[PDB]
Amino acid sequence: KARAKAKTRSSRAGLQFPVGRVHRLLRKGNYSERVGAGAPVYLAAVLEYLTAEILELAGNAARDNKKTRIIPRHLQLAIRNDEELNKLLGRVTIAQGGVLPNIQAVLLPKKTESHHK
Amino acid sequence: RHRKVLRDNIQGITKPAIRRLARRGGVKRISGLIYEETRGVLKVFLENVIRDAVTYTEHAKRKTVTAMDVVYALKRQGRTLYGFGG
Amino acid sequence: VLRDNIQGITKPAIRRLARRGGVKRISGLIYEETRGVLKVFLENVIRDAVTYTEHAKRKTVTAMDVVYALKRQGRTLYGFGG
Amino acid sequence: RKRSRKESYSIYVYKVLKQVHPDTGISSKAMGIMNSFVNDIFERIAGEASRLAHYNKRSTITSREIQTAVRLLLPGELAKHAVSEGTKAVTKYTSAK
Amino acid sequence: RKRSRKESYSIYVYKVLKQVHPDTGISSKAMGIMNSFVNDIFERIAGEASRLAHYNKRSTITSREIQTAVRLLLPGELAKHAVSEGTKAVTKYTSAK
Amino acid sequence: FQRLVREIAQDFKTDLRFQSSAVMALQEACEAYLVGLFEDTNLCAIHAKRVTIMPKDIQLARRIRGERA
Amino acid sequence: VKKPHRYRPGTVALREIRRYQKSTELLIRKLPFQRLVREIAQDFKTDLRFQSSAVMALQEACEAYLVGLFEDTNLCAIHAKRVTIMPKDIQLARRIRGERA
């Protein structure tokens, strides 16, 4: 016996997310009788990619307000300004998120407010 | 004295607060009749939510309503909420 | 001749549908818009259906695939099995 | 000294953030939001995959079912990119045990 | 001679219909509708019961869980009458084992 | 309707075959969706003190129900 | 100036719009909302207590729902060539969303 040292599957997948934790959460929760080996890697990679996308947008919005730390407002701005995420999270409320500044053009004053004598 | 502050009830949810909320919704000019109707609407929403929360509360034999029960109750009505646990 | 085949869904059929909705008067521009609208709905449904069909590695589309794909859009359907 | 242990996904998110935008931090509340978000997505996918398994009289949930669920839930190019990442990941896993 | 077996709830619907309205028939299509309906409610309730049980870390489904689920899903008086019927059923069953 | 469905499915995957009942199911779903939409649309039209429906009515209803597409 | 300075109608509302849309702080005061919650809970079950975070969560949900409703309301209003929202708009919005009342 040699007992090769304890490399982990996440490192093998080139991922940061924990494969084993997802496997555990699938076993416990009664989604199905059996679970296949390849599923949780795929699943973890999916979650990582989405998380990266969100944080990317949030960081851009953060730089717009000259703040170095991400706060919820930035996340709300990130979600609502990207079409696909808005579809995915169409019925979700972000706490302390607020809304976009969109005001309809009609209720804004007349742009023909100029030199008038 | 009969003070009963504006009713000792919902009518403490004053007009300018509703105005502020309408300002968040992009609204510019509001009629006087909106206020009462809004209150009614609010009441209805709250009722349903609280009922579900309390039902969850009754299942676990507790007398303190927790955040998690409210979140799940909000989830079943298609109004999922993030930022208060689960 | 065929006109990309959406035109098989003729105007008077749409008019009959509007009649069932309790509508009395229809502008001539509705029809084209409706066609586009319809197409979108169908597209989405079929995609989901075909995807279920593809998972079973079958080549024949079954009603149950459609039923599930409708179930996922919140337009649950009764009366065609399951 | 009863000492609890409440698990979360916080640290992984923090790692990813330091990878993508090194000079930036993130508050605790936003991390809680992201944690709830991940939990939601996990539940949706698992439920969908379960129903897919039951309809076809299969007792194993596989990567294929996950792939199918993702193609259903998500729109377009997002689905394609996610699928590509998953396929690359499983391909790397299968070889370099 | 290889041949299949398809389960349904036809007979039970027929019994109930004869009990409430002995002199009346029903077409097969409507029977199909009722079959779909029954299956849909079964799915909804079981799903809800599962979610409740999981949130309180209890591994068992009892009549209590079903009852709670019913009060959540169904409105008012309908829930009350249904609860009464189910309660009577359980009390008679446990009395007459 | 059969030919439309066959063309679209062909655009997604080739040489497919369709059970009759699936086509019927799609038929029912489409017509139910359309009538629901036209009902809400008619309400929207009456709200503007008209009796003739117009595209913006449909767009409004579709935007509110969340079927934005 | 002999006259006190006065803004024309339709500007301070805009100022309010920009201020409240740049910020995220809750608009409604805590206490009356808290009393309302307790009063309504009493009619279903007696002697209940509430954690603070649960009330805060409810407040957030209510404000988001109403905010969305006012957005839909204003669109329904604009369709009728008005700028002032009225109850029938709200009734229409709730009819279209598929809710009960």
Choosing among 1.10.20.10, 1.10.760.10, 1.20.20.10, 3.90.1580.10, the CATH entry for F1-69 is: 1.10.20.10
Cα separation, C34 vs C36, whole angstroms: 5
Q: Which of G58, G83, G87 sits opposite B70 (nearest CB)?
A: G58
Do C and A make contact, counting contact as 3+ CB pairs within 8 angstroms?
no
**Domain extents for chain F?**
1-69
> At D93, which CATH number?
1.10.20.10
* Residue D21 at interface with chain A, using a CB cutoff of 8 Å: yes
D39 and D18 Cβ atoms separated by less than 8 Å: no
> What resolution in Å is listed for this PDB structure?
3.9
E-strand stretches of E5-97: none
Pairwise CA distance, residues A42 & D91, whole Å: 10
Contact D37/B at CB under 8 A: yes
Residues 6 or more apart whose Cβ sits within 8 Å of residue G12: none
Instruction: Give how many domains chain A has, as a whole number.
Output: 1
User: A23, A35 in Cβ contact below 8 A?
Assistant: yes
Closest among B86, B85, B5, B10 to B44, alpha carbons compared: B10
* Burial class of A3 by CB neighbour count within 10 A (0 to 12, 13 to 18, 19+): exposed
Distance CA A103, CA A81 (A): 15
Helix residue ranges per DSSP H, chain C: 11-20, 30-55, 63-72
Number of domains in chain D: 1
- Map residue E26 onto helix, strand or coil: coil
State the best of E7, E8, E26, E40 to mutate against chain C, taking most chain C CBs within 10 Å.
Answer: E40
Token duo for residue C36: 């586009």
Q: Do chains E and F touch (3 or more CB pairs under 8 A)?
A: no
Q: What angle do CA E37, A92, E42 make, to 5 degrees?
A: 15
What letter does residue A37 receive in the DSSP assignment? T
Residue E79 exposed, middle or buried by CB count within 10 Å (0-12, 13-18, 19+): middle
Angstrom distance (rounded) from CA F53 to CA G1: 54
Chain F closest CA to C21's CA: distance in Å? 5
First to last CA, chain B: 47
Angle (CA) G21 G23 G29, round 5°: 100
DSSP-assigned beta bridge partners for residue G32: none
Cβ atoms of residues C31 and C11 within 8 Å: yes
Cα dihedral value C29, C32, C35, C39, nearest 10: -120
The C-alpha of E8 sits at a distance from chain C's nearest C-alpha, in angstroms, of: 10
Determine contact: C10 vs chain E, CB below 8 A.
no
- Rounded distance, CA C79 to CA E35, Å? 8
Closest CA to F65 of C5, A103, B4, G97: G97
As a whole number of angstroms, the distance between CA E67 and CA E73 comes to: 10
What chains are in contact with F, requiring at least 3 Cβ pairs below 8 Å?
A: A, C, G
G95, G97, G98 member nearest F43 (Cβ): G95
**Angstrom distance (rounded) from CA D38 to CA A25:** 13
Closest among B28, B70, B34, B29 to B51, alpha carbons compared: B70
CA–CA dist E51, D43 (Å, integer): 11
Other Cβ atoms closer than 10 A to D76 = 10
B46 with G40: CB under 8 angstroms? Answer: yes
What does CATH list as the number for G1-101?
A: 1.10.20.10
Compute the C-alpha angle C21/C26/C32, nearest 5°: 100
Closest-CA distance, G41 to chain A, in angstroms, reads 24
In degrees and rounded to multiples of 5, residue G38 shows phi and psi of -65, -40
- For the C1-82 domain, the top CATH level (class) is mainly alpha
- The CA R_g of chain F, rounded to the nearest whole Å, is 16
How far apart CA E73 and CA G23 sit, in angstroms, is 37
Q: Chains contacting E with at least 3 CB pairs below 8 Å?
A: B, C
C25-26 vs D25-26, strand pairing mode? unpaired
Q: How many helices and strands, by DSSP H and E, does chain C display?
A: 3, 2
Contacts with F57 from chain G: Cβ below 8 Å = 79
Q: Per the CB < 8 Å rule, is B24 touching G20?
A: yes
Under 8 Å between Cβ of D86 and A46? yes
Yes or no: say if E13 and E31 are a contact pair by the CB < 8 Å rule: yes
Query: Touching check for B78 and chain D: CB below 8 Å?
Result: no
Whether chain C has a CB inside 8 Å of the CB on E87: the answer is no
As a whole number of angstroms, the distance between CA A55 and CA A67 comes to: 14
Q: Which two tokens stand for residue D39?
A: 């939990």
List the structure tokens of E7: 């389960």
Residue C70 to chain D, least CA–CA distance (Å): 12
Report the DSSP beta bridge partners of residue D26.
A70
- Structural domain harbouring E17: 1-97
Q: Please indicate the experimental technique that yielded this structure.
A: cryo-EM
Per CB-CB distance under 8 Å, the chain G contacts of F49 are 80
Query: How distant is the Cα of F48 from the closest Cα of chain G, in angstroms?
Result: 5
CA distances from E17 to C81, D77, E26, G32 (A): 21, 52, 9, 53
CB contact under 8 A, A93 and G78: no
Q: Which fold has domain B1-86?
A: Histone, subunit A (1.10.20)
Q: Which of C14, A82, A73, A16 is nearest to G25 (CA)?
A: A73
Nearest to C49 by CA among C74, C73, C70, C76: C70
Chain D CB contacts of B82 below 8 Å: 33, 36-37, 40
User: What number of residues does chain E have?
Assistant: 97
φ and ψ at residue B11, rounded to 5 degrees: -65, -5
